[PDB]
């Protein structure tokens, strides 16, 4: 017992037409969108924003960002999900009735498996939780303003990400609300697990390798089984319509190193002496202090973004990234504000 989604998947190929045929002076806003809602703007925006303005958020924010990819990898790698493009050059679905028009966008033409939304569950399990702190901290102050502000704000963030994911023919509308929902529940449920605070810099490590150790036997047992990983390559070259716009890596373990050395990094800022002299010093909470330092760690940090490490070796590469992936908190919580102290010395 067990028949097709070719439903939904038509469903979902009708929305794109849909949206396609009429907004057709709205590509440049969808992908302004798509871009910005690249997770590349949590651990270098948001968390030097946040992290200063009050300690707390900012590490469940990083928690639930870094917890949500290792989601997003390992159940994308046993769902083999299809794309709204691609899905209607080869299913014959349309072969007793008419094909729909699909165009594509030099955005479009992804190469890899596409059954959890990253954009959406990463941008549901970020921005949930800025709003609810911040719903949480304004409790000082005739309430049901504020408050359908922020949900009425937060809502349409949502939608936009998931119109723009729809809009350039890159997924599903249920692939999208799943990954909301289940951005959603992952940030509810580190909402109350209160023990990653004040964490000992043995159990960081205890953590990264199991995640480490989870990430890598399960990628060898699937493999030792007959299970195909490399199925979205070939038909992703075959169904493009320009070889050029085709983006082929060589990376299977890119992101899981990236995630992993910011959790690292986080762990050694914590529970470094530098950070207790520096961030927890004597009168040095005053809020201009925390402004200026949150400017200077973006500045230089999106000074230094702009590095590549040498693929010309695959190892170095990884471990050229682990490394940086460990500054990027290493450097905004301990030794900025320290030379900032040091400044305010003279």
Same mark, same amino acid.
């Given at each position: 017992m067990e028949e097709g989604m070719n439903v939904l998947h038509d469903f979902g190929?009708?929305?794109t037409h849909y949206l396609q045929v009429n907004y057709q002076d709205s590509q440049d806003w969808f992908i302004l969108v798509s871009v910005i809602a690249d997770l590349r703007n949590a651990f270098y925006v948001?968390?030097?924003?946040?992290?200063?303005?009050q300690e707390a958020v900012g590490i469940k924010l990083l928690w639930v960002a870094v917890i949500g990819d290792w989601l997003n990898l390992v159940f994308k790698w046993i769902l083999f999900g299809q794309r709204p493009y691609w899905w209607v050059l080869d299913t014959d679905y349309y072969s007793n009735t008419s094909v729909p028009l699909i165009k594509q966008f030099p955005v479009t033409c992804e190469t890899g498996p596409g059954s959890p939304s990253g954009h959406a569950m990463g941008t549901a399990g970020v921005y949930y939780v800025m709003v609810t702190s911040t719903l949480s901290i304004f409790q000082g102050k005739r309430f049901r303003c504020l408050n359908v502000i922020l949900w009425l704000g937060f809502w349409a963030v949502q939608l936009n990400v998931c119109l723009s994911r729809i809009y350039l023919a890159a997924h599903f509308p249920h692939?999208?609300?799943? %990954?909301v929902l289940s951005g959603i529940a992952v940030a509810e449920t580190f909402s109350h697990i209160h023990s990653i605070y004040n964490a000992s810099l043995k159990?960081?490590?205890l953590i990264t390798f199991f995640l480490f150790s989870f990430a890598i036997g399960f990628y060898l047992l699937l493999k030792g089984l007959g299970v195909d990983l490399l199925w979205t390559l070939e038909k992703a070259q075959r169904w493009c319509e320009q070889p050029e716009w085709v983006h082929?890596?060589?990376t299977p373990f890119a992101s899981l190193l990236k995630n992993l %050395?910011?959790?690292?990094?986080?762990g050694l800022a914590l529970?470094?002496?530098?950070?207790?002299?520096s961030c927890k010093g004597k009168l040095s909470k005053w809020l201009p202090f925390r402004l200026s330092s949150i400017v200077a760690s973006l500045v230089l940090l999106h000074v230094f973004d702009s590095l590549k490490p040498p693929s010309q070796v695959e190892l170095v590469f990884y471990v050229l990234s682990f490394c940086k992936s460990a500054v990027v908190p290493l450097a905004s919580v301990s030794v900025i504000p320290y030379c900032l102290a040091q400044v305010l010395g003279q």
């Open positions: 190929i009708q929305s948001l968390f030097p924003i946040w992290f200063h303005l692939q999208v609300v799943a %990954g159990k960081y490590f082929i890596d060589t %050395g910011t959790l690292f990094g986080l529970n470094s002496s530098m950070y207790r002299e």
